[PDB]
Amino acid sequence: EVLITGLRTRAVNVPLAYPVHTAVGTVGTAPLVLIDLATSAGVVGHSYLFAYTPVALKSLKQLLDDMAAMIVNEPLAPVSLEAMLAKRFCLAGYTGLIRMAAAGIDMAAWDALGKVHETPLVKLLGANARPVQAYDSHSLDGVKLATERAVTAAELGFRAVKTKIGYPALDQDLAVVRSIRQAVGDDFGIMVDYNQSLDVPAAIKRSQALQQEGVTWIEEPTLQHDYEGHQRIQSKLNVPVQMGENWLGPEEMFKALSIGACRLAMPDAMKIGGVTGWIRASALAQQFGIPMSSHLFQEISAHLLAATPTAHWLERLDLAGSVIEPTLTFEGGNAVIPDLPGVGIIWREKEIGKYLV
Amino acid sequence: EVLITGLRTRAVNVPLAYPVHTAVGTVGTAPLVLIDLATSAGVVGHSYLFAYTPVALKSLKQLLDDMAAMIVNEPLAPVSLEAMLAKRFCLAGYTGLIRMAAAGIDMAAWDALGKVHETPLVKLLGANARPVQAYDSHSLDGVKLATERAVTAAELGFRAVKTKIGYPALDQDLAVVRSIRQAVGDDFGIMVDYNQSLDVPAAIKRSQALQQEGVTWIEEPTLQHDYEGHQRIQSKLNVPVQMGENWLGPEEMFKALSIGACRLAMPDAMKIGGVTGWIRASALAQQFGIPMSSHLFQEISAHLLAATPTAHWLERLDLAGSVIEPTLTFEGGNAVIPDLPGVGIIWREKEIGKYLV
Amino acid sequence: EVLITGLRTRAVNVPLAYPVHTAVGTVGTAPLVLIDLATSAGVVGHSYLFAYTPVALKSLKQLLDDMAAMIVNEPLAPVSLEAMLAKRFCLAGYTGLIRMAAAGIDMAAWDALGKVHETPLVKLLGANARPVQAYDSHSLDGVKLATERAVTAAELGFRAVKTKIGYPALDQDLAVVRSIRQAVGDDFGIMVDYNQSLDVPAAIKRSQALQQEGVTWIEEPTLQHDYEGHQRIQSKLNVPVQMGENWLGPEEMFKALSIGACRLAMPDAMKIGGVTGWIRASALAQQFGIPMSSHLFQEISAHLLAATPTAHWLERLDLAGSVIEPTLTFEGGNAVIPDLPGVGIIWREKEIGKYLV
Amino acid sequence: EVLITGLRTRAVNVPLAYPVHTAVGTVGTAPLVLIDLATSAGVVGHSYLFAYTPVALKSLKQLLDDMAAMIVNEPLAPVSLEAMLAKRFCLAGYTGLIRMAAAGIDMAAWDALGKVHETPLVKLLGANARPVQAYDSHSLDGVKLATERAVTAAELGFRAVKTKIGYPALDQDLAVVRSIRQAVGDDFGIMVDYNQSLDVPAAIKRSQALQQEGVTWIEEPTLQHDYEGHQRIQSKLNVPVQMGENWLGPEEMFKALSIGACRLAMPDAMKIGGVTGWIRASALAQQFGIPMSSHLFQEISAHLLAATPTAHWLERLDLAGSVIEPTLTFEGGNAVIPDLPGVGIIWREKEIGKYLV
Amino acid sequence: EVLITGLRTRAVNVPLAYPVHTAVGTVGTAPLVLIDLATSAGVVGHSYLFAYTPVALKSLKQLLDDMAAMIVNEPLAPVSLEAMLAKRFCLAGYTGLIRMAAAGIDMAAWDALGKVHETPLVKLLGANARPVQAYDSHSLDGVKLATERAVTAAELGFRAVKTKIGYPALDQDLAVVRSIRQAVGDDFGIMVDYNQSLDVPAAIKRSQALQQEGVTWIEEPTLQHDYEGHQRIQSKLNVPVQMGENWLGPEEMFKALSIGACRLAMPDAMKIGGVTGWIRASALAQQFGIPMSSHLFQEISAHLLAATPTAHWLERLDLAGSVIEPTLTFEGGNAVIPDLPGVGIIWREKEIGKYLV
């Protein structure tokens, strides 16, 4: 009985705090698609998608625009909407850009549903808000900048940071981790992210060296789809292998956990299938005994982690801060959900116009 | 913010329409614990528990009354409440009667949350109401009564019935199924339930003979906890093995599905862990590719199945109709969710007094 | 040395000979993206993509146009180009629409390389042209039309047809297959396609009944990504399960074959990763002992199957005949590769204008 | 339409730089069979076989001579030729000397096909030439000569060397590795090769000792056909076990990788089945996540590795330098493919006459 | 002490009684290498090899002649000689033609050792002579000839025959088996041989149809090296899959039995590694519970089967009768070992001259 009455998309290329350098390439600004889902109840649901590369940005906006035909005049019932989209895209492939688009709709539909009920999303999911520990996510920064960023994060109350590694030599990876460690002390988390950049033997060699140094987890050591390879790496380590940012739907998470690819998981709220997909992922992580963190999407992930039985860490990487009001706050390194209906995303309407593509 | 302010229980032994004879003993009236969860918002959540045998009825009410103090003044946040109860009962064993008591609290809490938002439970879960196909659940009735009840059900619009089997002779099981089939035709479901009454070899022999007759599924052929034995029985059959009414929590479901015990599942809304546990179960059934039906608890199961990705059948077995208003209806053999906030359970307050233990 | 100098795409919605009705919806005209790859040698490579639904058509063209800048000035070396694209799209997700776009580039690049060498693609791959047996692919046509089309195909020299099944009743599936079989005899192939429309238990029941009738294979009985479910269905059948049209890349094929999902494979030249991906797939099918057929893309698949060690059947389903010259012919039910350089695709330039979106 | 018009073989015993001592025996000169495949296009394909021991040299030449009857007047289509030979030798056993002969034909046929198209082989395979890192392959040289050969290699720009080990005592293996390491520094690869000389327990003991020293890989620790044994050794190591030089066809590689025998592979261009076999192997190594190096045959392996998705190292061991012009060069320790049609093998016709058998 | 003093080989192409037509080509006369092993005790060991195709005949003789120098002056100790040859050929590959050559040496060495001790080979192995049941091995003969030969064999006292199948149509396979069965009755063995001619799905379909007819075993349904495929075929059958004639060494047998490829085995005395290899094989067949028959080599196989714990059938297919005296006899369908020292092979010296290549 509340119906969707409109879908609007805006493509933007927005400025970050610091360019996200990785072992496989740099992201400087962020290409986002901002989504507004109008309803018969007046309220408007807000979400956004991350396109990764500007090469996919227009394509992703166009796909969503064409997908409006499937959702306008449908009831605002995200679980029912998701089943419908899965069926309509059965042939095309309910994965990749299509799935990402479907997840943007889901996230905006749950924001609207929270607004219909004048309640924060975390409460609509049946949970209480609580503070959620966050790590500050950095990049392939070199020794000097990595160490500076770590010090600043520790000063702000974060109890962990993540750096991106996969320099040409193992010794360069180790020099960065060692430098951070000396600056932040032993009682501090140092997560490291390979961004898929190693083959299995190289990953075993580098990871056993990092384990000796002392790191909190080793993220995506090899090609993301190679769950068997991740299992073989994890088999040679005490430190946990972390992955999951690239899982497209809970069905891909299921395949990975079924063969023991990793001891930690970190679904992406977009790629996993939005709120609907996230809650399903949550249930899998619980049964498989996997502590579950987030990947990007810090605004909605604060809510979702509060409803996740094995919640572990929130990834602080603020891609959309230039266009979303800072209603999510951090106190003592913990994310603090705002007391606002739905997700608590309010657009900075005058800023968005600066960045439209 | 909205808080639980009180808990009241009433233990009743209520009359059914027809004693539930099984191969392992018969349930002639139903022992129930009726639950009222008061809240700071003025609304009262309603749920009930089934104690199976009167021997466990007073014990279950006593347990719930002694749990009032742990939930009074807690937020009405069913997911957060479930986590607290799991932790409190870590030592005692969060299973059996304790888990059943937790599930009754969960179901009444979700009823109350629907009421707080003035919305049916199905919509609060993010799904649309839809009619759900139901089968009429009968008992170890003999050829004459079994065939009469089947015809009556078909007359009323049901497209399937379940009968309880496990007579002293296989020939008797087959005689009942044949006489039903003659009276209802080939385009009709006949589910059969062994209620754990056979050892593995006996189950293989009886089930392959039933399979030749044409039945829709074979339910609980052996001891419910023996997942490996259910796997061995399934390995010898084309017809699906059905089980799950006795899983205490989604963790037991996960263990059974992980070894291939069955090709169908039917969780019990109480034993699975209420709404919270059911939603977890539904995620598991989706990933493992298992069509998921309900067991008893028809009032809440109509809502839950509408939010279940692999929803299969609703079991119609009306245990509580003597004390709950008939707001759930059946049309054309489909359950129709009432348009009422929460679950739509309203007590028949003048009838309850008759049945107090 | 030979370089790509440009990329042009045209999005069309083209008329078929007969709408493709499936159990999960119907494809009434075909949305295609036509690709022209210009090179420094003067020759132009041609390929096309199938977008399945018009909803994805503009998005796919947009994506390819935004990929021009990454391939312009690169060498015309399809293997090296594929590696570059895999790396560039590591973060976004090298799957779904992105992977499909990469595959269209690959197919046009191999067409261009054949042209550079003035040699049919089959010979450039190191194989001899040979006729390849083809089946004529029909749709959810009903008893009358299905039987007519089967007779017509048999009259024309085809030795097999495929029909789409998954009618509301199993009896209807069986009625269609029986009426075909009566019209064509026992010495004729009848493949059947469920287009992912059944859950595992339903697929076991329907498939064992079809198996009694005599069918050649059962294609995509359940959700395409559910390899474990396809294994469970295959485990109950003598007839081969066929799948693979929905594998995105050889890595998905490898996962499916590694767990015994099917006893036949049919990769899609676009989803498998073009020629580059097809040749990989062919190596896998050889080792796993899986006879390998094609899915759509008949123009290029005739070349590719001639270089496939376990080549089985070519699927005749002419999606692009309204815009491509009929240089591929069929004689005695066998596809005959034209003696033209590259793939032998030549555009009907005056027809394309009619169908532009 | 280009046909094979002749096959010529020449058996030679040619001089090496240094005798190849192994733990299982010494190779001084090299017994080779030189193969010329004449064609209707005028061009002549060149390849060679390595016979390992002079005991097999005449046999291998005679077999090829008798195999001429199967290939003369056939089309120059290596993939089609390979399928034909596999069928004709189905009964005899398409392995061993037979398979080696078939691979010599394949390698010469692809050289001819490159020549027909006036293009280097790497380009005909769809890839770009790039430099490929090479290690210099030495022998069971003792401490003094091993150290001298390593120093000379490092001076020439090689970044790794391989020594052959399996001296009577483990301490002798370790003394050689230690001496090299001191001479070349920590940032240098030291590969070691056992040449099948240890049983599994001895291999676990010696390899864990070598791992402590620091080596790059441990090659063929036990009997080559014992894939289970290799798996058991690899299970006790962090350092990768390398094998594959003895795989006769991709089918043997498949069997080894299916059970986890090794974390690195190094097919032999002859034994694996030539170019055709190599490309199939390439596809397997990619899926199984195995970095893939070459074994001998440096001339063609430079081409092949440039088309191998998981390319790792080229083995520099110049068996045929006395009879093939040095068109393959090494710059900075990288092999540099010559810009010549086909493989770039040109016979030293006046030298061949010195070495004929 | 007793030493080998010389080796002589003669390559012959000998006439059979009836060309051996198979689904994969036909063997019209037999190419054999006849072996004479001279010793310091005055006695000469005799054996022969089968080269399958004349293409390999000269190569095999050449190889053996070039192996004379490695065995001359070695002790006549077949086990110690086999170990030496395995080590010498470690690099070349102790398989295929090389392994076959080693096996001919082994068989002639055991013949010589029987002669040294003046005792039949069976007694030297520690067993008693006994008659061994034999089947008469026929070819792809057609309904008329197949049925004639079956009757002739039954008339002579054989209790089973083998026919070669794999005609273009399954109906033809079935027509041949039915016409045999009609002519010989139900109390008679009909073995069928596919000679590797079918892919796995084709083999499942053909074999289940043959199984309905009643056959004794199904031999080599698919590619001989594909043990996993033979397992998949066996998994669908009640009738036993038979294989093993193509195992090169007991190590290949071990790999096949380890994965459940077959429920019967039939090693070839030459390919399995002669007497030495056969005795190893017999130990494996015993442990794995596999009834073990012979393949060709009837003269020596009668001795070997008498020492085989799970001895099943001797294959009567007399390849060498044109050049070996008929000292092996058949009575009542059983092979009778002659009372002669060693194997009982005596050359027809005046006939050999007729058949020299």
Ligand SMILES: O=C([O-])C(O)C(=O)[O-]
């Ligand atoms: O931050 C991450 O974990 C990831 O590497 C990303 O940047 O998308």
Ligand SMILES: O=C([O-])C(O)C(=O)[O-]
């Ligand atoms: O619980 C029951 O009464 C029975 O086992 C059922 O399935 O309905």
Ligand SMILES: O=C([O-])C(O)C(=O)[O-]
């Ligand atoms: O894609 C299709 O239209 C169908 O599934 C087929 O197999 O042809």
Ligand SMILES: O=C([O-])C(O)C(=O)[O-]
């Ligand atoms: O060099 C090698 O890797 C191998 O041992 C050989 O010499 O053939």
Ligand SMILES: O=C([O-])C(O)C(=O)[O-]
């Ligand atoms: O080798 C053969 O001729 C045949 O395969 C047999 O079993 O006899």
Ligand SMILES: [Mg+2]
């Ligand atoms: Mg990451």
Ligand SMILES: [Mg+2]
């Ligand atoms: Mg029951």
Ligand SMILES: [Mg+2]
């Ligand atoms: Mg299909």
Ligand SMILES: [Mg+2]
């Ligand atoms: Mg080596």
Ligand SMILES: [Mg+2]
């Ligand atoms: Mg045979």
